[PDB]
Amino acid sequence: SAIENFDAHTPMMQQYLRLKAQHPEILLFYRMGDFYQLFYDDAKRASQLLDISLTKRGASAGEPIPMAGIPYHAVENYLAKLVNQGESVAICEQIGDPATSKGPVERKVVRIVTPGTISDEALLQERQDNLLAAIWQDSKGFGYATLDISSGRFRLSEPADRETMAAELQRTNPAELLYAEDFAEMSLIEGRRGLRRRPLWEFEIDTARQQLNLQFGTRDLVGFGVENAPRGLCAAGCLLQYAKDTQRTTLPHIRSITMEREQDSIIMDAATRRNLEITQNLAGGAENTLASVLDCTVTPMGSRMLKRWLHMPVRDTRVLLERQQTIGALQDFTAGLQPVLRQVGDLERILARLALRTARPRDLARMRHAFQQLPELRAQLETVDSAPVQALREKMGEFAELRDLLERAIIDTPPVLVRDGGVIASGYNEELDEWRALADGATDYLERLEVRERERTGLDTLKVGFNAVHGYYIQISRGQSHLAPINYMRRQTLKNAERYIIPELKEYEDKVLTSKGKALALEKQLYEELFDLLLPHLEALQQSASALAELDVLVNLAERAYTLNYTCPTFIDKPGIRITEGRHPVVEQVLNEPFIANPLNLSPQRRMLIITGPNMGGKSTYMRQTALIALMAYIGSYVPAQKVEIGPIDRIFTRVGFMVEMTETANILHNATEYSLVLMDEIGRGTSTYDGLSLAWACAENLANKIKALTLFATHYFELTQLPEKMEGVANVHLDALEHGDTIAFMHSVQDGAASKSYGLAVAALAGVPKEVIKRARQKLRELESIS
Amino acid sequence: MQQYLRLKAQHPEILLFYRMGDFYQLFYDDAKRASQLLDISLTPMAGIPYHAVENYLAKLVNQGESVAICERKVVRIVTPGTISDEALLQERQDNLLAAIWQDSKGFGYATLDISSGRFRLSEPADRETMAAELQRTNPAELLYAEDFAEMSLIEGRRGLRRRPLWEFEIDTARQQLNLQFGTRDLVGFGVENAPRGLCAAGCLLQYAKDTQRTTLPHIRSITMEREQDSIIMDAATRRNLEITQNLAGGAENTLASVLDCTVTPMGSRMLKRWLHMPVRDTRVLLERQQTIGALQDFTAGLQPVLRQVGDLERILARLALRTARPRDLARMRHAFQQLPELRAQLETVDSAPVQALREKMGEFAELRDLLERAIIDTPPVLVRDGGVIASGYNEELDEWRALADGATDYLERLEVRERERTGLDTLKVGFNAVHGYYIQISRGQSHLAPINYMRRQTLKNAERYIIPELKEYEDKVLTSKGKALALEKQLYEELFDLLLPHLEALQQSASALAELDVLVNLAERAYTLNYTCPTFIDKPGIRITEGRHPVVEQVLNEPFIANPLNLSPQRRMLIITGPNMGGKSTYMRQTALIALMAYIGSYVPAQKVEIGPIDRIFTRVGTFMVEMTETANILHNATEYSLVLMDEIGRGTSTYDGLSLAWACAENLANKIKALTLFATHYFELTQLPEKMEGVANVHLDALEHGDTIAFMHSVQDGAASKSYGLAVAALAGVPKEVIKRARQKLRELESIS
DNA sequence: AGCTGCCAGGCACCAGTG
DNA sequence: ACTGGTGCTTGGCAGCT
Numbered sequence A: 001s002a003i004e005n006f007d008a009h010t011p012m013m014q015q016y017l018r019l020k021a022q023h024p025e026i027l028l029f030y031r032m033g034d035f036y037q038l039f040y041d042d043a044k045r046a047s048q049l050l051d052i053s054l055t056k057r058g059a060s061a062g063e064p065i066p067m068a069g070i071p072y073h074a075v076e077n078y079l080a081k082l083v084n085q086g087e088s089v090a091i092c093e094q095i096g097d098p099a100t101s102k103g104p105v106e107r108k109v110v111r112i113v114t115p116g117t118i119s120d121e122a123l124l125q126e127r128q129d130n131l132l133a134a135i136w137q138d139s140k141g142f143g144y145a146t147l148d149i150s151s152g153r154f155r156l157s158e159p160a161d162r163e164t165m166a167a168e169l170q171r172t173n174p175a176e177l178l179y180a181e182d183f184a185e186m187s188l189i190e191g192r193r194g195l196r197r198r199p200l201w202e203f204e205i206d207t208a209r210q211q212l213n214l215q216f217g218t219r220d221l222v223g224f225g226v227e228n229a230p231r232g233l234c235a236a237g238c239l240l241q242y243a244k245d246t247q248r249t250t251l252p253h254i255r256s257i258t259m260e261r262e263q264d265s266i267i268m269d270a271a272t273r274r275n276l277e278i279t280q281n282l283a284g285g286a287e288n289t290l291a292s293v294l295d296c297t298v299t300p301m302g303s304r305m306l307k308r309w310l311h312m313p314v315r316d317t318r319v320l321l322e323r324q325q326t327i328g329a330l331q332d333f334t335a336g337l338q339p340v341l342r343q344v345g346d347l348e349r350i351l352a353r354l355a356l357r358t359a360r361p362r363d364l365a366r367m368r369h370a371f372q373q374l375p376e377l378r379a380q381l382e383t384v385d386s387a388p389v390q391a392l393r394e395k396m397g398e399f400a401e402l403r404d405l406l407e408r409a410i411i412d413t414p415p416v417l418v419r420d421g422g423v424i425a426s427g428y429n430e431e432l433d434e435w436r437a438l439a440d441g442a443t444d445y446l447e448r449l450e451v452r453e454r455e456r457t458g459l460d461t462l463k464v465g466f467n468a469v470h471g472y473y474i475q476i477s478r479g480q481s482h483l484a485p486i487n488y489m490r491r492q493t494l495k496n497a498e499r500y501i502i503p504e505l506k507e508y509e510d511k512v513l514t515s516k517g518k519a520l521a522l523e524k525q526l527y528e529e530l531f532d533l534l535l536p537h538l539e540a541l542q543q544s545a546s547a548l549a550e551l552d553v554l555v556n557l558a559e560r561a562y563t564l565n566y567t568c569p570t571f572i573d574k575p576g577i578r579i580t581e582g583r584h585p586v587v588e589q590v591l592n593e594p595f596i597a598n599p600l601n602l603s604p605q606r607r608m609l610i611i612t613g614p615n616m617g618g619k620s621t622y623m624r625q626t627a628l629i630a631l632m633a634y635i636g637s638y639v640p641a642q643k644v645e646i647g648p649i650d651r652i653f654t655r656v657g658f659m660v661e662m663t664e665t666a667n668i669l670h671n672a673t674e675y676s677l678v679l680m681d682e683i684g685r686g687t688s689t690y691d692g693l694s695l696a697w698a699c700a701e702n703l704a705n706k707i708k709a710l711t712l713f714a715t716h717y718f719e720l721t722q723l724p725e726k727m728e729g730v731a732n733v734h735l736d737a738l739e740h741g742d743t744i745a746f747m748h749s750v751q752d753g754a755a756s757k758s759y760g761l762a763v764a765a766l767a768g769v770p771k772e773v774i775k776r777a778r779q780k781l782r783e784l785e786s787i788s
Numbered sequence B: 001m002q003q004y005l006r007l008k009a010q011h012p013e014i015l016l017f018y019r020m021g022d023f024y025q026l027f028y029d030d031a032k033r034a035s036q037l038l039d040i041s042l043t044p045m046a047g048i049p050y051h052a053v054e055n056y057l058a059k060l061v062n063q064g065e066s067v068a069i070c071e072r073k074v075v076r077i078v079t080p081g082t083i084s085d086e087a088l089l090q091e092r093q094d095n096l097l098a099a100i101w102q103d104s105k106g107f108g109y110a111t112l113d114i115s116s117g118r119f120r121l122s123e124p125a126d127r128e129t130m131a132a133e134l135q136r137t138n139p140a141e142l143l144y145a146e147d148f149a150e151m152s153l154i155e156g157r158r159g160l161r162r163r164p165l166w167e168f169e170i171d172t173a174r175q176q177l178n179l180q181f182g183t184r185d186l187v188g189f190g191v192e193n194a195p196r197g198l199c200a201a202g203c204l205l206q207y208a209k210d211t212q213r214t215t216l217p218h219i220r221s222i223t224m225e226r227e228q229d230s231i232i233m234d235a236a237t238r239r240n241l242e243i244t245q246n247l248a249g250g251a252e253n254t255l256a257s258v259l260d261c262t263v264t265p266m267g268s269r270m271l272k273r274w275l276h277m278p279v280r281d282t283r284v285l286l287e288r289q290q291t292i293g294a295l296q297d298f299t300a301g302l303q304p305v306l307r308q309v310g311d312l313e314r315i316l317a318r319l320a321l322r323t324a325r326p327r328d329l330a331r332m333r334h335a336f337q338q339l340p341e342l343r344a345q346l347e348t349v350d351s352a353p354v355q356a357l358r359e360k361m362g363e364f365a366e367l368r369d370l371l372e373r374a375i376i377d378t379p380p381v382l383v384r385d386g387g388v389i390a391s392g393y394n395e396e397l398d399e400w401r402a403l404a405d406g407a408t409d410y411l412e413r414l415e416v417r418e419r420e421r422t423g424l425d426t427l428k429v430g431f432n433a434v435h436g437y438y439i440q441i442s443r444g445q446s447h448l449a450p451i452n453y454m455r456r457q458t459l460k461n462a463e464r465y466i467i468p469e470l471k472e473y474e475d476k477v478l479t480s481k482g483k484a485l486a487l488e489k490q491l492y493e494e495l496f497d498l499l500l501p502h503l504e505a506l507q508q509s510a511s512a513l514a515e516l517d518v519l520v521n522l523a524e525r526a527y528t529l530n531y532t533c534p535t536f537i538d539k540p541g542i543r544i545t546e547g548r549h550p551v552v553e554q555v556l557n558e559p560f561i562a563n564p565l566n567l568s569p570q571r572r573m574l575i576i577t578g579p580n581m582g583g584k585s586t587y588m589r590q591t592a593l594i595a596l597m598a599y600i601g602s603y604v605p606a607q608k609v610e611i612g613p614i615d616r617i618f619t620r621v622g623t624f625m626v627e628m629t630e631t632a633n634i635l636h637n638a639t640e641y642s643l644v645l646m647d648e649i650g651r652g653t654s655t656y657d658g659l660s661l662a663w664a665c666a667e668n669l670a671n672k673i674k675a676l677t678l679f680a681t682h683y684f685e686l687t688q689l690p691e692k693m694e695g696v697a698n699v700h701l702d703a704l705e706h707g708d709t710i711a712f713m714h715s716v717q718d719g720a721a722s723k724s725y726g727l728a729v730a731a732l733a734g735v736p737k738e739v740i741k742r743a744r745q746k747l748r749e750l751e752s753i754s
Numbered sequence C: 001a002g003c004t005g006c007c008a009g010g011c012a013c014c015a016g017t018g
Numbered sequence D: 001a002c003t004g005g006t007g008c009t010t011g012g013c014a015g016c017t
């Protein structure tokens, strides 16, 4: 192998290796003329991933250099293939002029595309958030931060233990996760996508405080409510440094950060989120989830928001009452408002492209279209007497001046890119109309010259055309070419035609080309100038989009409440849940038979229910629908019952029945309070007969007598139906079944008390177990029943 | 695209690829279904590039979709069960076409491997066996009749193909099958009185033929697979034993990942067929045993040679179909060149069956030499552009080539001549399709082009010209190359004519080579992995000394613990108590895997295995309802020659219900069915079973508490267990001390009545 | 509407003359 | 050192059929 010292390198590879050195573990797309190039292992890897040719750049001194590339104009399709696989890519461009550089033109990395910093519409899913996170660990707990680069939403939390951290990763589901190198609990994090090991120094607290204050223009973070939170600040500081390093521009839409405190929301553990099938079902799909039912938002930014609420229920009584109020007030207005809200589109994401100075012409066109909907929205919402609706109406704004600007500046349907022009409209800049008019008293001139020269020469094949490589020409066929004026300067020869130039045409070529380059250069100057006039209003524009997304969510929840027959729940002072004719929101829509509504009464005196009933009798569904009603109540939605009264809930824990069951259970026992809702679904496993049930008993007992949480405790262990007897706060309910001769009917109705019996043998027979075996099993059963 | 509609009507069940430019494009419901299947975008249009079409055919074909291609009319169709091109197939995985049909009596089933010509027919007697045959054979494409009643069997399957009833008519099937095989009746195949089976085989054969529009001379035979010739295993058993596929859908940590170090793709595919179909006939088994023992010493020598043989089976299919490409003939040649050496190595082996495989392997010396002379060392992928036929094979071809090379030589000397005369260092001769041969000169020098040069094309920095002299020799080069290209193709088609008469003997060779690869591998595995030769007894029984689980013992870096087993008619059920934690399950599954391997003819991971006949293996290992439904299947179908492994049934319902079921099953398995059974349980009350009845005994696993953990020992010991560990595992996991203390009190109180 | 092959714009290489 | 020719990815499209 060759000693690759600096001097043994060509000027090209000197520069290239300097720049790859600053990006040693990621693919570097390196601009040379019309191509992005890769070298060495980048080329080999790119070749395998992207399905392009692996070639060689020849070398005078040494071994050939592996090489691959793509034309600059095809870059975004390739960037998409890469980022979809979790690959980052540094984009290196030419800064300088080749004509004034002796050696290689100056080259800089201008951006890095990574899975959690993308903002382009082609690389994202419309209805799903794409978050960058950072995480780190102390001896005591975790700091965690999230950034949605394509809306500027920047958050910080400090999950106190392992399980809260598992729960947070599941909630936020980052596309890319920066973690510190000394991270101990790797089981939380390994086998996630877009994992990015970072050095310790990027989590340093003084640096974080410094960069965040600089980003926000503040002396301190007191006003944001995070000066208190160095654990979280350390993560947020890593995150911000990564974001600035990927974008390499200012980020004026990141103007704020907020701490998500434990107390602010209901904290659902990892099992609970999975078990309720909120946005993801139990097989990874998005069908048959709570979102598949509640989500008929008409804008992308609203679909995202609704899913954020579903996942993070709020404990602020005022916010909830305000949301409920809104939903009752808009019930009659949904049909008129939705088709209009739809037309606003995904303004949030456009505003981020505007902030990053990346917005394309169709973004400004959709921004303009959106502004055009604001008066119709304003008019429709005026009539609605509800202060919260009016507060949104106000916050959404109007932006008359900016709407006018975009109507006058850009044409009706502009092209996808500004690169080829045809974007700025006539009337907006007079210097531009003058340059376009010189390259447009042009198509007409070439025709009159064609006809004039055809008639003058007498040569009827004479045509005038253009060719990018050779320029304008007069063409005569081969058979007539020998008759051409001797004045005609030969320019391009073809198999069956000859092409010429004369000074009149050459002078007209020189004027059309230099005035096209002036028209385009000035279009680009003016289009960048649209950003300068929009940007000052960014703060108010971002508030408008969030208002519009909220509107979309609530208008939606109003239509859902109507169409699906939901009521307004009420909040009470003490823990408790009173449901009348309650229903599983999801199961009631997918079942092709009537859903049996069910009550529930939980209070501080009636705090644990031991639920029995046969397998397939409805014990899990009844538990889940309780949690779903609680969750819907605490995002502000109407709920799928005929009446619900509900007290404060701090946390929802779930255990759905090895070392893992007993560990999850201990978490519940260490961290549940009198304000928690606890769903235990057939827990207690051991290696012998009574082993695991005894544990279940002692656990039920600790939940009832010490923690005093509100617990639904589904079991197959009939012995646990003795607990009410011995234990203040516990009672039996059950799922009713009937045995009419040789079969079982599942009624799906909760009744008070323990069931008459268990039905393990009935269910057994239903499953086809031979009748001779069930006969002996009953005989044995009666032996056991005679014990007492 | 008003013309697209009329071509979609022609085949409305199949996806239509529709050529335009570099792409094939799909519209309406084809585009929708194709974008979710393949990963591509919408517009209703999706499209694929031309240079990768075979890749997207392979992916759609792998998912059960037939595909028609249009170039204007439908010129080619690929169906999932009838492909044979190597780009579309997976090297180490069988691809079957199947037909199924149903009588008032029972089922008819047929399978075909279009590449090998392996054609099978069965008549599964009931619902459960039919389900077992479908999961085992896993056809890529499945023809069924319109009136098929039991749609629950096939509903979920990829590549379903609804078919008219008349395709399953018996007299037509008999007739087409007799014609295909050159026979007057099917007695010589032993299927003459299997009319349900034949109806399935006739529909299948018709469909194959229709998709090929070609004779299928490699399909010369059919066999019938009978119930009693194999150990039956339902899907759940097959899945639990992790034969070819693991529970997560992959190929790792599987029985095949450990046993299948074969060296040819055809041998690997045959080994996997053997693993999934253990046979009851000990005659066949003994021969495989003897061969495995006789080949121990020859293994290091044989395998590097056999690896060079490659996939002769699949290359041969393409010879049968007349689609074999130059590297297929070149690999066939390469395989013929190994036979002398394999013949020499095997001559010494003391084994009638190895000597039979050695005869059947053949030599084909005359075909070896034919392709040595006919084709060059490393021919190009396609015949299309020539350069495949060797120089010296045909005199006429050598002359056209010399005439081309002499005109090509002339034009190189013309280049140097014109370059010397004019004094123009940039002068050169090139060639392309538009201008044929031309003289190029750069733009800076082109103004000194001789006046006899006729300009033809201006480039940005060059001018190309012609002269009469140039066009003259172009004509020599081009006409020569054209005659030699047409001659190469005619000579290539002639190789097929000379090779194909030996097709039958060549399919025997590839098959023998495949078997040898299986056995040479199994012999290397027996010797490498310390396996031993099992013996067979006349009555049911399993006696294992230091048995091991073959996958677990290679996969984990912790000492594997070997265990005995003694099952006989006097001792036919073991009640296995103690912690499970993997140990009971592994012990039970290694029992099944040893039995399965004994019944493949392999050596087995043990110091000693004696084993009686086994008709079925049932392993219900690892909702309550699905657990009870699987138990139901055992109790309805197991016999006194069955092996039954059951993992702690009763869990998921109440203590007394579940204990009553477990008790009553055990009784039934021991007193009525009399299977050989390992009955794993958590119920201590079941350890009283040995006192209450004959042929039942107690064993157990225990654990050792030390330092701050627990070591769950994997050693099976005599007697009931006397410890539970649920509570000890709760303490370790951090369940508060006071909770455990209370659980201990309640445990004692609960167990004390019992 | 298809198929072949020049071109884009960087920089290096290479071979002939200062 | 300086002059003028070459080559290299892929995708667009001219220039021939």
Ligand SMILES: Nc1ncnc2c1ncn2[C@@H]1O[C@H](COP(=O)(O)OP(=O)(O)O)[C@@H](O)[C@H]1O
Pocket: A587, A591, A594, A595, A596, A597, A598, A613, A614, A615, A616, A617, A618, A619, A620, A621, A622, A748
């Ligand atoms: N209230 C109800 N009305 C109608 N069907 C129900 C109801 N609750 C549950 N089910 C259905 O019955 C089946 C069993 O429900 P499940 O909650 O799993 O019972 P369990 O957990 O007790 O075995 C599921 O298909 C479920 O959809």
Ligand SMILES: [Mg+2]
Pocket: A619, A620, A621, A681
């Ligand atoms: Mg359940």
